[PDB]
């Protein structure tokens, strides 16, 4: 339950530029607490595996190899 | 969260060793070993040993066991990735890992660092056995013995080979042939590789299979009452007999004691030679039949 | 009767061979404690 919606491109800079248009996406992103991209991506890990300490490869062969292959 | 999740993430928890390693564990866990026989045999043959010598024995004793528990718990990543292969085939995972942590201890206890071999060398025959000895032994609710599972699992090897040889499921004949053994033999193994099914299964719509069950032995109203009436009818001809010869139809066929009586045992409680109460049978027995006595048993025939 | 790790121990190597293993193995503690 609401995985906070920074953290999904932060697996993936100028986050506010693209997308200043919404008002609230920005401040939603206001609200995320996590900076930078491998730092949000462990946020994003603990709740997909609960109770595996992560490993730095694991952390990026996370993301690409849940939905995108 | 999670059984296994929970297994893997302690056997993590060890690092996995090298060949030196290996080599030093296995000395020290096989001179505790012989350290620990020594002094078994020290006491029956007396041969005391020096007080000293004995204490740094014993801790050879002791000290193999760390030997012995540090090498599994290092190679126990090698069991899950042996017993990984063989999940679905009517073994729960776990159950596939502990068996396969059985063949494992069997390899430390046999393992030689003499022959200079990496540890998973010589320790994955013994896990890949274990996890396929206890398949046999455990998946079938029935538990088909090792030799039997062993000639199923060739035959449909053989079956499935010829089957691309010939385009087509072969017959019994052509399977006996290719196994070198009788076409009555290859049918029976096939009636016995059939697998059972569950009573609780359901079929169409909330009817559980069990409910369908008929109890043979469940006792039919309609034949015991007249199995109670045959045995008064029979009651009456016994009384149109004489009491000797009422007496013996009864011993013979046990009618009160429930069990029959052979001549000789009749003879006993009658005091007559066996010959006579054959006789005797014989003449009995043609009375039954003659008209007036069997004219009503004739239709309780069925 | 079964087949325990002496007997699987003792089919592969004999008592000479076991007999010098334990004496390294006793040299080391003896070491250990002599030696500083």
Redesign the interface.
Same mark, same amino acid.
């Given at each position: 339950r609401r995985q906070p919606v920074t953290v999904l491109l932060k697996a993936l800079e100028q986050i506010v530029e693209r997308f200043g248009f919404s008002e609230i996406m920005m401040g939603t992103l206001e609200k995320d607490t996590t900076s930078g991209t491998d730092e949000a991506l462990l946020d994003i890990y603990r709740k997909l595996r609960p109770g595996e300490p992560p490993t730095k490869e694991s952390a990026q062969t996370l993301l690409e190899n849940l939905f995108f292959k | /969260?999670?059984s296994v !999740? /929970?297994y893997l *993430?302690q056997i993590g928890k060890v690092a996995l060793l090298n060949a030196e390693e290996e080599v030093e564990l296995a *000395? !020290?866990i096989? /001179?505790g070993?012989? /350290?620990? =026989? *020594?002094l078994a045999e020290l006491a029956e043959k007396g041969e005391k040993l020096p007080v000293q =010598?004995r204490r740094?024995?014993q801790?050879?004793c002791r000290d193999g066991d760390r030997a012995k528990n540090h090498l599994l718990e290092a190679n126990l990543r090698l069991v899950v990735s042996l017993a990984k292969r063989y999940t679905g085939r009517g073994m729960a995972f776990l159950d596939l890992i502990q068996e396969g942590n059985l063949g494992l201890i069997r390899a430390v206890? *046999?393992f030689?660092y003499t022959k200079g071999y990496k540890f998973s060398t010589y320790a994955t025959w013994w896990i890949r056995q274990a996890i396929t000895r206890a398949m046999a032994d455990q998946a079938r609710t029935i538990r088909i013995p090792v030799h039997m599972v062993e000639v199923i699992n060739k035959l449909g090897r053989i079956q499935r080979e010829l089957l691309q040889d010939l385009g087509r499921e072969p017959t019994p004949e052509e399977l006996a042939k290719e196994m070198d053994i009788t076409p009555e033999k290859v049918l029976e193994i096939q009636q016995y590789a059939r697998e059972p099914i569950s009573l609780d299964q359901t079929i169409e719509g909330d009817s559980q299979l069990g409910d369908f069950i008929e109890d043979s032995e469940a006792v039919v109203a309609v034949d015991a009452v007249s199995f109670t009436l045959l045995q008064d009818q029979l009651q009456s001809v016994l009384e149109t007999l004489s009491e000797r010869e009422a007496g013996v139809v009864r011993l013979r066929f046990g009618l009160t004691d429930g069990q029959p009586r052979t001549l000789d045992e009749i003879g006993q409680v009658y005091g007559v030679t066996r010959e006579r109460i054959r006789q005797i049978e014989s003449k009995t027995m043609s009375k039954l039949r003659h008209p007036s006595r069997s004219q009503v048993l004739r239709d309780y025939l069925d | 009767p079964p087949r325990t790790h002496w007997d699987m121990l003792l089919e592969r190597r004999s008592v000479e061979e076991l007999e010098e293993l334990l004496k390294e193995r006793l040299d080391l503690i003896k070491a250990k404690r002599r030696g500083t």
């Open positions: - | /969260a999670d !999740r /929970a *993430k *000395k !020290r096989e /001179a070993l012989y /350290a620990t =026989q *020594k =010598q740094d024995m801790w050879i206890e *046999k030689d | -």
